[PDB]
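Bench log. Compound arrived from synthesis this morning; before running ITC I wanted a structural hypothesis for how zinc ion sits in the protein. Inputs:
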Amino acid sequence: MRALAKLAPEEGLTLVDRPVPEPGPGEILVRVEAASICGTDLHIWKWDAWARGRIRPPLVTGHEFSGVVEAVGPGVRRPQVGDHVSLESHIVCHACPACRTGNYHVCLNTQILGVDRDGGFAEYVVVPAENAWVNPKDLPFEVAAILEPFGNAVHTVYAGSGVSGKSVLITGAGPIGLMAAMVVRASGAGPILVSDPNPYRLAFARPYADRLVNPLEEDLLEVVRRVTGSGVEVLLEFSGNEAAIHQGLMALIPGGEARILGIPSDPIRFDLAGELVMRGITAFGIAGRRLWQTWMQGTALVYSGRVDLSPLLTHRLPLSRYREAFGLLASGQAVKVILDPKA
Amino acid sequence: MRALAKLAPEEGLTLVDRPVPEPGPGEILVRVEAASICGTDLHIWKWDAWARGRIRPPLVTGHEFSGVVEAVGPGVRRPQVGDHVSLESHIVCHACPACRTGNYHVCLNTQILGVDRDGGFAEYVVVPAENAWVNPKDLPFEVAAILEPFGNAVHTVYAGSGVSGKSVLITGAGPIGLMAAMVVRASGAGPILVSDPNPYRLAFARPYADRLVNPLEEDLLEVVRRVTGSGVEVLLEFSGNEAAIHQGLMALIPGGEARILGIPSDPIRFDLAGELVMRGITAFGIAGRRLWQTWMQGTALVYSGRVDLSPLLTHRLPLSRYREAFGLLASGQAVKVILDPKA
Amino acid sequence: MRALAKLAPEEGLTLVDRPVPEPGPGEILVRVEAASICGTDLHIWKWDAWARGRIRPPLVTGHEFSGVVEAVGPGVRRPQVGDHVSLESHIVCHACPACRTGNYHVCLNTQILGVDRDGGFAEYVVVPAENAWVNPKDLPFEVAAILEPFGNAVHTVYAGSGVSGKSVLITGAGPIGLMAAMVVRASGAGPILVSDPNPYRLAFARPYADRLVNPLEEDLLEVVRRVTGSGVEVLLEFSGNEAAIHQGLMALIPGGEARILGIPSDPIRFDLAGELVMRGITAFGIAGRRLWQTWMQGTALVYSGRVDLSPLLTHRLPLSRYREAFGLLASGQAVKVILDPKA
Amino acid sequence: MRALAKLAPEEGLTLVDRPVPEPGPGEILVRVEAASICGTDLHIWKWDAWARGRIRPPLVTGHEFSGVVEAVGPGVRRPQVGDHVSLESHIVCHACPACRTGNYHVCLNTQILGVDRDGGFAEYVVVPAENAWVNPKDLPFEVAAILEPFGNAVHTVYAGSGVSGKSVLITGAGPIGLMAAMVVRASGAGPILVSDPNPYRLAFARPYADRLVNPLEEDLLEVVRRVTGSGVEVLLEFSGNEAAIHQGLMALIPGGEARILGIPSDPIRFDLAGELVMRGITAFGIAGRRLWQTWMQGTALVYSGRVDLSPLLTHRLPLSRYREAFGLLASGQAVKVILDPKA
Ligand SMILES: [Zn+2]
Ligand SMILES: [Zn+2]
Ligand SMILES: [Zn+2]
Ligand SMILES: [Zn+2]
Ligand SMILES: [Zn+2]
Ligand SMILES: [Zn+2]
Ligand SMILES: [Zn+2]
Ligand SMILES: [Zn+2]
């Protein structure tokens, strides 16, 4: 089969041919129909600091994908051959304290498909049977392929007190932030403010947000004061940019909540007293997807039509042309790019 | 000044002339621009048991109204003359276990506007300044007049775990239940099911629900099963109808939540163990509006446009044609009737 | 081995000799060191209505027990041979909506050890590997044997808003109610009131409760008003007695919580409006133990010494003398009776 | 009347004579029976930056006091002459986003007793009637005097998911952290770990903690590991010490909660991604006392006897010997110092 791999400790990826993996007990073989690309994949590709401390070549990458269950291992009762599925990238241990608590999304021994073991940028991939989420047969694979990143948005948005009937500020219009914009709008947030310095990304958030802000042309804190009268009740942070983080926290009203998915590249200077403790703020560290309630909430929204992810699918390319694909992503000229492993 | 009052211990109300009242300390004088009527007012109309043991004539009725701050009492600094406001009907004592605990919606010393003291079915009314909710000048008074009953819906929907990304069954398509349908739809619930025997009421929910059900014509359970695959996660009960209550609980998946606003006219037969305990169901008794939180969530929905309450106002009549307003009520025909105290 | 069984659709149980069960994939063989008896077992014994609709002879009963892992099935990584364990009686399916939600305690396909399949009133018993909770080797088996019923108390007490710094009323001094009395006292509840008509049971609650009440000699509602000044914030109901339920709910303050574990023998007449909806009460149906957080909280309390269950172990008898054992229980002359299968 | 005041922009305080103030509308006149001092008072004492940008002489300091209602203002009906009361130092505006939302503890217009206006370091003080908490006549005034700072602890412990049945690490054994230790012990936490370099402070917690740790002498992490098997579920931070903050977060299991009352004197270096985001940690900024809830939980603990605050009062000095009280403070020696304004 065809597969995109990182064969050595350097830049780029390579198209190779590998035998079809085989599912043993508790596993299933999945025929990949669509897969997507995100920041993690871009770290691997550029072979930067992050990638260097986490990746161990050889590795077939790809952690955002959907396909059909082509085979199951001995004893696997579910899913079943023929089922259409989306995949949870985190493989949890079930033998640590986080798992005991039900906090699977932060399992101490978390292993990630396409990062720690072979992923979905291939025609076939073997994953744990418990990691498969069966979708309605009419759900387009393309959309099914991006439920994983969508989950991140969902998790962030519904963490804490949620967003229904509350003012919200989203800092970062990257793909997950655009997705969170769709979710807060379909959840009854209002007013909704989305802030991002890149025009191309902001635009994508226009049909959902009530006010778009380019922190580099308007004083975010002041637009917020004029839109709400003071501050927002909720801050959803997806960029990791330190100045946005500080601005965003200053934007919260006392007693508010900041939910943080964004990963800053370096430690930040933080005024614990001023930005959190003294104003009674609660900061939520968001990681992964809550195992099963995040998937339940998110697929509920998509299956029923409360949200429509389609406009986020800016490009479709055969896996063969992966280079053009990463290029588009890397340049900010795309939101969700789909790769087809059959071509 | 024209006012509509219950002058003696009997059915009906009487159109009267009273001098314009004056606000003392801590009070304001509202020039009412719009009022609405609901079941409570009906109880007072027909002078039934309830009214009998509660109303003390002479009394200007009405608790659902909006208007303008004509003048304030000495030392009152909020709201201000010229402010457009809606009224919270519950006047809380601030001196009971319920208020201390922050459960003002259930103050044991609750004094209701229009039942225990003069209400808004008049050109002017004096009320506690703390009961006034200031609205943007551009919100129609007609809509502002129904924010109180809308709050009841809001309170029921956001109670417990909310409804975002969840399957919801709403029993009762009367005015409040209908507002609930608008809210759960704008809050991202899905699938959304609404059940009520009256096809008139049920049709108002078509643009908000995913599935409409007349339980007298279809098996509600079998329909819930076909739409969700089993049960709903949330039950929102507005009818107080015993059969609907029993059926709704059965449609709830184990571990789900039932939030009850509906008041049955008589005790029900309840299999505590089978309908609640053994299935791990939690039942929420909803009453009033959480003081200020319910108003914040609801008005945010309205102000931002997440929900549009216009479709619920079927009739606007002059206060002097009240005989007909109370008839529409007792009959069913309308959803929410507005009364114009200036005519 | 020795085992206590229900061999036919009638009263009583029978001592028999059966081969030692064998653990297959995903299972473990447990050598039982101690087991206890409760109401469920008494239903089976008396072969009453309940038992008749649930039991299917032949059945080795016993669902409250602890022992040592004597053997594990092929592939079972944990627990391990030699481990000391307590057992969760509920065997969950992992393929229903409750399980999906994490509400394992109300799994639609729940199977119960000692009720639906052979239990612990035997020298040996095979249970699912995932149902074993490993205890510190120095925890006395006797105490380990009663962690299952303890969990019920724990679940009830920590459901909702918990009990820390709140007035609590416990109706029912049966064994789980006494256990809940120990837990609310070790949790910072205050004042704590325990009410039960049986003197022998009340007494057991004296070192934990702040006020003991015999509803049949004092007006429960009035003692409560004098102890708190109005009502309690939390009601923990363990009896299922209808008058206690009504009394208890009347005892709650508006906005309070009632957590119900008690199973009434017959439907009750319930004034939905008066007892729940109008006073903003929230009723929690408690079933089983939350899979893992209930066990985490409860074993934490026991391992650290925050609670000491020992005084509840009123009797110890070899399994051979099971009849005297059930007799004591049936007569209200005991709290937790331990049966030893080795004799 | 004797009072202790900051009369000019400099260090120190001055013992003075003022006429007994009179309560206007909505106010009461408290005859102070006991007052206490904390770090804030110290800031005012040494007149540092903080005090500099906040205090406006002439000002009678003190915010931790208890006393008797000597007389009430016209029309004040609660509390009453003769009532023993404690004072909430925060005077809230009831006109900001924070108050509307019910987050009075963080009112943007908070006016503090003894910092923005006359306090209790005097024989008499006039305060808003709504700030008085009525105590049972038999509670010692000395203990009643420290309910305010105790509330800070209470608020920190019960924030988030509470602590019952959970493993807890408390960093900082100063007065508040020590009160926190008493509360978490009385609330059923276990194992309970308390870390602080000062062996004087640490010894006060011996009767409440399960494990005492001097982090300068032992590796806090390795100790937490040996006591829990991994990490603690809850982190309660009271020191504001950057090193303790970083170490405590590391000791928290993934998905745990950190509740921070501690105010660092300077911004910290914070690895947002590593210490919060990637581990799914939630950090709670705790400030003040939740208005009325914190007081209800705390006083219930005290009134019922779940906690005994007596051990925390090391010294009781006449107000006139304040020079020494402020010395004990700045030095460490004592826990809580009481000042008797009648001498
Ligand atoms: Zn991704
Ligand atoms: Zn794990
Ligand atoms: Zn109404
Ligand atoms: Zn009240
Ligand atoms: Zn049992
Ligand atoms: Zn199940
Ligand atoms: Zn202080
Ligand atoms: Zn305020």
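What the model suggests: Chain B has twelve helices and 19 strands. The first strand of chain B starts at residue 2 and ends at 6.
ITC booked for Thursday regardless.
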